[PDB]
Design a protein around this ligand. Structure first.
Ligand code: CDL
Ligand code: PC1
Ligand code: PC1
Ligand code: 3PE
Ligand code: 3PE
Ligand code: 3PE
Ligand code: 3PE
Ligand code: 3PE
Lengths: 155, 177, 37, 459, 128, 606
């Protein structure tokens, strides 16, 4: 490895763009860098932001675990778009429809738990009755004090 | 699209890949074999109707809206074979696929445990290191200027010469080590 | 269409070499030669 | 403390008069004997610190750092003898002399009874570390990394010199034992605000604080392995030691001067763990993990409760052992693939199973698996920061989630998956490498049995 | 007819539904042939070193070294302090610090006011 | 006293002895899996005696045998709580683990790392019995994190597989999110009650226990796969089948439920925490049993089954019935471990096939697996007087007859119907009908390891509910008077579920094709939650982690403000000093300007 195989500053002339596209081993027409807003990408290519899950699993890759080839320009977020991580693959349902159905289901279930909390079910009985003034000494009541007499009657 | 040999997919290949994906997702939808067999013959009829279509624009349009048909009518969890990618047993045994060069780093007391295996391995290593320079000069004389156009490898042409770049295809590990 | 003749010849030669490799992967009847326990 | 200073100086004629094939074995043997002898410092008492002379003493804070320091030298000699095998004999003896001399400075840095002696030894520890990084570092960036390592520390510490000489002129002494009884309250003024900054910012750089940590993922990466071991295991803990001494004098002004630095460290333990989630360099991942772990020690010293000091000294010892072992595991792969890129060598459990067991145990101690002293220090810091404010449990728990994530991501990336096909120089694990891993891990696991000797002066 | 698939950032558009896949024009054929040629030449350059009996080491990828040098070592020389970077450095750099500062300061002022009034129940709290 | 405590500690030390055996080895073992299976059988035998002499008297004790540490007022001891919960869970877990390991000697036979697998499985058992017998929160945290780490090591068993590593890291992620609340609870109890011991927690008995119970509910949400923190458990089927059967059906996943039952004297006095647990458990048992209706992988259906039963356990904790919940743990263990073992027998006999759409006709080709799978499905749905009846029927008859969230009760009953629907989905596609598997029939269930391992849990699934329900003492007052539509709720709703799913499954033979409804795509894609959140939250975290944290702060701005600007300023001042032209005229003219400034402007002559 040497100097003119390392990334450089943002390309401005078309021959600097062609030299960078040769450097990253890809076509000049397919080479797009990140836009020069000063964020610090240099001449590094903006690859189309796909996970490695979308790569062809039947192709004989140079790195079969990564679905990546030798000499291929890696994505900037290759550590992020591994198959152990963020997947961008096409989903059988639309993304917005998934988000609407999941948010509506969670919100409806929380609203109905709140309604059922506001309107609780119970049984047609009185409170459970206990001897010895609703169990005063058993519930940790001090014996120096004397509670009010809680008397329960037969029915 | 993406192939090692070709640079693209033909229209006929796209239609066949659509037909196979449609039968597999239909089999996922149509679990029982007689019912799948019925609807698979119906799908074969739907592909045989526009089969003899010589207008490439009309065939391309029918292929495109047939892909929209397939996308609207795909099974969300289709049947995947277990060793197929996505399947429940895919790349399971890759932790047991130790490469061949790890045998070179064994201690001689465990190479003495298998005398005939390593004695038969040394002639493979010998055969490879005599085949190597001939297969390199085979590749450099057949590949055109500017590098190879496709990823296809040429076979061996003489007798006694091995095919070029054969070692990591032949000495790959098994599927159940 | 299927393979080219070059591809079939290469698959045939690689198949022969692969089957020789896998047949050499068998054990001997004397192997594993163990040290005395 | 002179019975440890004199054999460490006698390691210099022991490394310069040794036979040319014997200079690793002799220094390893006699530094192991010094490390055996280090356990006499466990003569600690519940009321009094072990006070040797007018110059040296050792309470229960300096004692575990001393035993870890005297234990780290043979392990640095074991780690650094393979990549310095083809070195000149004189340059090899110079490397061993720099290691021995850094230990010599550290063992009388932690035992300094008087604070300007602590400052002289504390800033004396720059020079062998600087020589090790800028001389036996591997890549081009070692010179720039030595510049950052030198000029953050001196920029922080030269106000500390003026602060300590001011305390010497005001109190009459910088003896820590006298200042335990002549400490006066430090009220609110701008003079005392900059007094607090001058006493604290050097140690904030040495921990490192978030925002001032930029010397560290270049000095810890561009050093050799012995430099990385000593920098991760002892030289970050010089800052926490100096904080726990010097915050005796900074009350009650610390009770509102601590807020910006508590915010910096409570947010830096989130941000540096997030940085560890996206590192391509394995050695830099361990460097930012060290920043993430020392942020909690900074918070624990700045809230200055007893549980926080106990957890901070336990976490300092635990992180010294764990980070030294993580750098040694990273070196064990770097000596095979010759690259610090973490995604390059994959699937290494298929090739090196016992070395992958060492990776597993160091990643479990990194994520603070109970009952390790990692979890003991982590847990006591979380208890004390919860008693400080109940909303810090959100940041502590989110840090623990990201810590488990990058620890097991490191493990899965280097050890699991399909192995890299084009790499075929993966040798089996040498006995030196596995012995180095075990001499890190086995004391770290045995300290879970009797953890009271690493919980500081106020266990 | 059928609901159109709407692609998202984390759920991309399929190859089977992309309108640019079905192009038969000669510029797309030459682009795909040139991409196959680049991939084939890099493939050959890899697997000549990969299948070498004399090689025992690492087939070094310059794309990987180039990626890591872009990710770490070349970021600051390609930095320009401008509007976007300064507002993202102030928002993401001192924003959360100020936020958690006022949160923990409010919580601790409230706790200290309740403690010095004897209002915070602190009966069995003796570990701290 | 002397027999109880001795056999208590001998059980755990006996379980630790093969760990010393596998670590102190030189040779290749004389069948180390048989050694660990025999050890766990004998540990079951050893653990039955303190259980019997608890059933005799109710004898409980604390073994605080080893003082470990004293943090100024917190004496941390190795302390073992031998109560009702330990005495009823240790033999159930040992009996189940003994059957799982005799299943494992057959299932994991061709694995060349079988000794490591049995080592890892025994380490899970040791950490789980550390969890369930602990008396302080620190040792309980040791067992907690221990079963988390062994969950990692056993999900990612085939570590070359990307999905196994991904699901294991997922499980660690959700369990550490639960650990946030666990450590919140430990922090609250230390600061406000000065303890981690359960005894001082129960005797001080705090009233403002909203926040520590919220932390405990978060810990149980992380550990027992409740809603929000559920998707790690269906992903956790990526490991081997005995891993699923032991850990992720019966033993590990009940630990958060065991944590909330363990704090029953604090949950009985907090109606807000009971309502939170009730709503969370009903949400979980609705959502996961709704996901299970349209799944095709058999282990996913049984994982959503066990997470629906965990939601039911959280419901019956929420109705102030903790002992019914623990009875349902000890009940659920037998038939759910046996359902996973029967599914794994199907997987092995159909050549690693885990999909129910490639099964069928196993009613006669696999008669014993069919028998035990039907028995386990009937015990799962609440067939009368099997093992699942004596817990689930009491749970339904106590959730009906109580002051309850009515929507939580209605979702509990809908979940009870859904259990019948997915159980007969398992029976229909796996066993009944016609074969759909490939043509080389290697169907074989003739190993005595498989037959005995299914047989012992089959005897368990027939009789354990009866035996345990007659041996446990009364701990509450059971509600046994209710109207007849309310007594017959569970059985009627389960029969309606069976009839509804018979209609559904018999309408699968018809020659109709229907495009899938949005309800089908909602239930089939797991309620969209592992699709949305597992893409979105790692996106917003890792883009932040690179772009903000790694790039913009700590390669650009924290490097720009202190070192780079100061270096450039000293560079620029260095260039201003040394840009002199060497002219003597100019230097002396500057000296004159110096003397003029010193006189006129600085008054140094004054
Ligand atoms: C003072 C006297 C003390 C005596 C008792 C000592 C106490 C423990 C000390 C340390 C023990 C661990 C060290 C050995 C393991 C590391 C090397 C290794 O991989 O060996 C495998 C190897 C066998 O494997 P192999 O198949 O041949 O090869 C490896 C494979 O290729 C691939 O390997 P693998 O992946 O298949 O196998 C690795 C496996 C992988 O499994 C795991 O990683 C799972 C472990 C985590 C989950 C389970 C545990 C959770 C925590 C609960 C336990 C602690 C508390 C329990 C108490 C009750 C609750 C309070 O790990 C284990 O099997 C380790 C078992 C012991 C676990 C201890 C905790 C380690 C976890 C990380 C820290 C946790 C907190 C600290 C706990 C400290 C406790 C003291 O072992 C050996 O050959 C043993 C060598 C000799 C070991 C000596 C250890 C003590 C040395 C101390 C010397 C000085 C004092 C004198 C006493 C000497 C007594 C003998
Ligand atoms: C890591 C890099 C940054 C390091 C930052 C270090 C801390 C920042 C603040 C340091 C202030 C200077 C040392 C103060 C020592 C205090 C001793 C004392 O007695 O104080 C009370 C004395 C009080 O005066 P006195 O002691 O004469 O009077 C007696 C006291 N009273 C007033 C009550 C009667 O304070 C001072 O005299 C001034 C203190 C502030 C000095 C400000 C100048 C320095 C500005 C900051 C520079 C920071 C580094 C910049 C360069 C970085 C690298 C390029
Ligand atoms: C196969 C080997 C076994 C032994 C065979 C040879 C001996 C034959 C049989 C006789 C037994 C030996 C003699 C009696 C034993 C010693 C008795 C005695 O008083 O010992 C002193 C003590 C008993 O406790 P103690 O209270 O007397 O002393 C503690 C020490 N101080 C007070 C200073 C703190 O120690 C032991 O017995 C040590 C054994 C410990 C066993 C548990 C180990 C746990 C491992 C994990 C550690 C981390 C847990 C962290 C969490 C804990 C919970 C919060
Ligand atoms: C009583 C209260 C009850 C409250 C209940 C609800 C609370 C929690 C709400 C949801 C928050 C957690 C869920 C979101 C994160 C999920 C991450 C995850 O599971 O990632 C898995 C993902 C792969 O998953 P999958 O798509 O299934 O893979 C199939 C095969 N490719 O794997 C990857 O993509 C790899 C990801 C690695 C990096 C992870 C980055 C995200 C980390 C998130 C931290 C969250 C911290 C929360 C702190 C809370 C404090 C209070
Ligand atoms: C990013 C790089 C890495 C990080 C490096 C370190 C960053 C943090 C270092 C400085 C920390 C902040 C300063 C100290 C804060 C503690 C409380 C304080 O003094 O607040 C500032 C003060 C508040 O007012 P008050 O304290 O009431 O004033 C009376 C003082 N006797 O406010 C005022 O009175 C108004 C402002 C006064 C001047 C402030 C700036 C100079 C002092 C700090 C240097
Ligand atoms: C404000 C603003 O827009 O600053 C932009 C300015 C450069 O202006 P320009 O866009 O070149 O015209 O840029 C500047 O004036 C230089 C930087 C301004 C201050 C940046 C403050 C945040 C720095 C990061 C803090 C991290 C902690
Ligand atoms: C156990 C109690 C069994 C008896 C009560 C249920 C009787 C019932 O309603 O049966 C209706 C139905 C079978 O009848 P049907 O489906 O209408 O006719 C097709 C012929 N197989 O459906 C059934 O019989 C299936 C329900 C059986 C439930 C058993 C487990 C509870
Ligand atoms: C917290 C503290 C933050 C500040 C720490 C000190 C500055 C950063 C570390 C030193 C400089 C590092 C660096 O990159 O220097 C290189 C730069 C260019 O100098 P040059 O000689 O061309 O480069 C070496 C040859 N390749 O060199 C320069 O631009 C000159 C740098 C001089 C640094 C002197 C520091 C003086 C501090 C007191 C100021 C009053």
């Amino acid at each position: 490895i040497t100097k003119d195989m390392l990334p450089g500053p943002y390309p401005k002339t078309p021959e600097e763009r062609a030299a960078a596209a040769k450097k990253y081993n890809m076509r000049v027409e397919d080479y797009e860098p990140y836009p020069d807003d000063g964020m610090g990408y240099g001449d590094y290519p903006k690859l189309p932001d796909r996970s490695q899950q979308e790569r062809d699993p039947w192709y004989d890759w140079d790195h079969p675990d990564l679905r990546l080839n030798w000499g291929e320009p890696m994505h900037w977020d290759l550590d992020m778009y591994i198959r152990n991580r963020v997947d961008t693959s096409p989903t059988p349902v639309n993304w917005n429809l998934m988000c609407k159905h999941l948010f509506g289901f969670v919100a409806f279930m929380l609203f109905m738990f709140w309604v059922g909390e506001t309107y609780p079910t119970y049984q047609p009985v009185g409170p459970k009755q206990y001897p010895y003034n609703n169990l005063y000494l058993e519930r940790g009541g001090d014996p120096n004090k004397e509670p009010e007499p809680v008397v329960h009657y037969e029915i | 699209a993406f192939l090692p040999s070709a640079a693209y997919l033909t229209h006929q290949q796209k239609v066949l890949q659509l037909y196979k994906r449609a039968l597999r997702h239909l089999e996922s939808r149509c679990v029982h074999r007689d019912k799948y067999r019925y609807f698979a013959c119906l799908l074969r009829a739907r592909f045989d109707e526009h089969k003899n279509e010589k207008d490439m624009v009309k065939a391309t349009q029918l292929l495109r809206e047939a892909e929209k048909e397939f996308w609207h009518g795909q099974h969300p969890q289709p049947y995947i074979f277990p060793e197929s990618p996505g399947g429940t047993s895919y790349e399971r045994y890759e932790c047991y696929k130790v490469p061949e060069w790890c045998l070179d780093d064994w201690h001689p007391s465990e190479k003495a445990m298998y005398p005939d295996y390593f004695a038969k391995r040394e002639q493979w290593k010998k055969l490879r290191r005599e085949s190597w320079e001939r297969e390199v000069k085979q590749l450099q004389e057949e590949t055109p200027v500017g590098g190879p156009r496709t990823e296809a490898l040429p076979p061996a042409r003489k007798q006694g010469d091995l095919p070029p770049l054969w070692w990591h295809i032949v000495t790959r590990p098994r599927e159940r080590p | 269409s299927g393979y080219t003749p070059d591809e079939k010849l290469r698959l045939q030669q690689l198949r022969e070499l692969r089957r020789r490799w896998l047949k050499d992967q068998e054990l001997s009847p004397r192997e594993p030669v163990l040290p005395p326990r | 403390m002179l019975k440890y200073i004199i054999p460490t100086m006698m390691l210099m004629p022991l490394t310069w008069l040794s036979k040319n094939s014997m200079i690793w074995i002799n220094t390893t043997l006699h530094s192991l004997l010094i490390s055996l002898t280090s356990l006499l410092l466990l003569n600690q008492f519940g009321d009094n610190s072990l006070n040797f002379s007018l110059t040296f003493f050792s309470d229960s804070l300096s004692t575990p750092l001393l035993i870890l320091t005297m234990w780290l030298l043979p392990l640095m000699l074991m780690a650094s003898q393979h990549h310095l095998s083809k070195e000149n004999l004189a340059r090899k003896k110079l490397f061993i002399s720099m290691l021995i001399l850094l230990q010599l400075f550290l063992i009388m840095t932690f035992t300094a009874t008087e604070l300007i002696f602590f400052y002289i030894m504390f800033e004396a520890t720059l020079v062998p570390t600087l020589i090790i990084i800028t001389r036996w570092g591997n890549q081009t960036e070692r010179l720039n990394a030595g510049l950052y390592f030198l000029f953050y520390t001196l920029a922080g510490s030269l106000p500390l010199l003026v602060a300590l000489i001011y305390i010497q002129n005001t109190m009459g002494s910088l003896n820590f034992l006298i200042l335990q009884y002549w400490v006066q309250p430090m009220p609110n003024s701008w003079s005392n605000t900059f007094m607090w900054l001058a006493c604290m910012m050097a140690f904030m750089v040495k921990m490192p604080l978030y925002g001032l940590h930029l010397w560290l993922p270049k000095a810890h990466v561009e050093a050799p392995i012995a430099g990385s071991m000593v920098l991760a295991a002892i030289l970050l803990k010089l800052g926490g030691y100096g904080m726990m001494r010097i915050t005796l004098l900074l009350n009650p002004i610390t009770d509102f001067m601590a807020y910006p630095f508590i915010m910096l460290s409570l947010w830096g333990m989130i941000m540096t763990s997030s940085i560890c989630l996206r590192q391509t360099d394995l050695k830099s991942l361990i460097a930012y993990s060290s920043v993430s772990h020392m942020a909690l020690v900074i918070v624990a010293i700045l809230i200055q409760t007893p549980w926080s000091y106990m957890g901070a000294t336990a976490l300092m010892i635990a992180h010294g052992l764990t980070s030294s072992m993580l750098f040694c595991l990273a070196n064990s792969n770097y000596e095979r693939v010759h690259s610090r890129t973490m995604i390059l060598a994959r699937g290494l459990q298929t090739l090196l199973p016992l070395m992958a067991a060492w990776w597993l145990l160091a990643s479990l101690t990194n994520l603070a698996l109970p009952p390790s002293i990692n979890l003991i220090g982590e847990l006591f810091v979380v208890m004390s920061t919860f008693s400080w404010s109940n909303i810090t449990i959100i940041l502590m728990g989110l840090n623990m989630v990201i810590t488990a994530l990058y620890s097991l991501y490191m493990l899965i990336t280097t050890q699991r998956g399909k192995h890299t096909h084009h790499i075929n120089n993966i040798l089996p694990s040498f006995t030196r490498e596995n012995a180095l891993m075990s001499l890190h891990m086995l004391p770290l696991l045995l300290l879970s049995l009797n953890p009271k000797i690493i919980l500081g002066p106020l266990y | 007819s059928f609901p159109k698939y709407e692609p998202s950032r984390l759920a991309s558009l399929p190859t089977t539904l992309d309108p640019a896949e079905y192009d038969i024009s000669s510029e797309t054929r030459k682009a795909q042939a040139e991409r196959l040629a680049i991939r084939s030449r890099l493939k050959r350059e890899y697997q000549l070193q990969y299948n070498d009996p004399s090689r025992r080491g690492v087939v070094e990828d310059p794309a990987l070294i180039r990626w890591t040098c872009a990710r770490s070592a070349n970021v600051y020389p390609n930095f320009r302090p401008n509007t976007k970077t300064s507002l993202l450095g102030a928002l993401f750099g001192i924003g959360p610090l100020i936020f958690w500062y006022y949160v923990f300061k409010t919580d601790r002022d409230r706790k200290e006011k309740l403690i010095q009034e004897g209002k915070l129940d602190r009966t069995f709290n003796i570990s701290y | 006293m002397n027999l109880f405590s001795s056999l208590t500690l001998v059980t755990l030390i006996l379980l630790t002895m093969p760990i010393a055996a596998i670590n102190f080895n030189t040779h290749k073992f004389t069948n180390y899996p048989l050694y660990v299976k025999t050890t766990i059988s004998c540990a079951f035998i050893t653990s039955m005696i303190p259980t019997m002499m608890f059933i005799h008297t109710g004898q409980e004790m604390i073994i605080s045998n080893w003082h470990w540490l004293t943090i100024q007022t917190l004496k941390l001891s190795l302390s073992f709580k031998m109560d009702f919960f330990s005495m009823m869970f240790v033999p159930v877990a040992l009996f189940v683990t003994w059957s799982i390991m005799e299943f494992s000697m057959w299932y994991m036979h061709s694995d060349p790392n079988i000794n490591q697998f049995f080592k890892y499985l025994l380490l899970f058992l040791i950490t789980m019995l550390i969890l369930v017998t602990a008396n302080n929160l620190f040792q309980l945290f040791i067992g907690w994190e221990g079963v988390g780490i062994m969950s990692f090591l056993l999900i990612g068993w085939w570590y070359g597989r990307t999905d196994a590593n991904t699901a294991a890291l997922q499980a660690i992620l959700y369990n550490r999110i639960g650990d946030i609340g666990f450590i919140l609870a430990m922090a609250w109890f230390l600061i406000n009650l000065n303890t981690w011991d359960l005894q001082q927690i129960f005797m001080l008995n705090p009233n403002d226990s909203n926040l520590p119970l919220m932390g405990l509910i978060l810990a149980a949400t992380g550990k027992s796969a409740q809603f929000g923190l559920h998707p790690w458990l269906p992903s956790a089927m990526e490991g081997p089948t005995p891993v699923s059967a032991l850990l992720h059906s019966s033993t590990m996943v009940v630990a958060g439920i065991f944590l909330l039952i363990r704090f029953y004297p604090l949950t009985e006095n907090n109606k807000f925490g009971q309502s939170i647990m009730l709503c969370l458990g009903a949400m979980t048992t609705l959502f996961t049993a709704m996901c299970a209706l349209t799944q095709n992988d058999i282990k996913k259906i049984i994982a959503f089954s066990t997470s629906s039963q965990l939601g039911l356990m959280m419901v019956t904790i929420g109705i102030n019935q903790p002992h019914l919940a623990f009875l349902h743990i000890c009940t659920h263990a037998f038939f759910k471990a046996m359902l996973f073992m029967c599914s794994g027998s199907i997987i092995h006999s159909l050549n690693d096939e885990q999909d129910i759409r490639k099964m069928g006709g196993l009613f006669k080709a696999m008669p014993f697996t069919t028998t035990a799978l039907i028995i386990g499905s009937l015990a799962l749905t609440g067939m009368p007087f099997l093992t699942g009846f004596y817990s689930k029927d009491l749970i339904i008859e106590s959730a009906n007859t109580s002051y309850t969230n009515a929507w939580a009760l209605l979702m509990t009953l809908v979940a009870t119907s859904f259990t019948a629907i997915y159980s007969t989905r398992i029976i229909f596609f796996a066993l009944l009908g016609q074969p759909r598997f490939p043509t080389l029939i290697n169907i074989n269930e003739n190993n005595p390891f498989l037959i005995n391992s299914i047989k012992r849990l089959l005897i368990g699934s027939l009789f354990a509910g009866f035996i345990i329900s007659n041996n446990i003492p009364p701990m509450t007052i059971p509600q046994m008077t209710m109207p007849h539509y309310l007594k017959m709720t569970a059985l009627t709703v389960t029969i309606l579920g069976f009839i509804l799913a018979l209609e559904i499954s018999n309408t699968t033979h018809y020659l109709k094709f229907n495009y899938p409804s949005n309800t089908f795509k909602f239930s089939n894609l797991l309620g969209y939650y592992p699709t949305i959140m597992h893409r979105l939250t790692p996106y917003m975290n890792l883009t932040m982690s690179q772009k903000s944290a790694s790039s913009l702060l700590d390669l650009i701005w924290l490097e720009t403000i202190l070192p780079k600007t100061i270096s450039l300023a000293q560079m620029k001042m260095s260039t201003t000093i040394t840009s002199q032209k060497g002219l003597i005229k100019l230097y002396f003219l500057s000296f004159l300007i110096t003397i003029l400034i010193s006189t006129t402007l600085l008054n140094f002559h004054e």
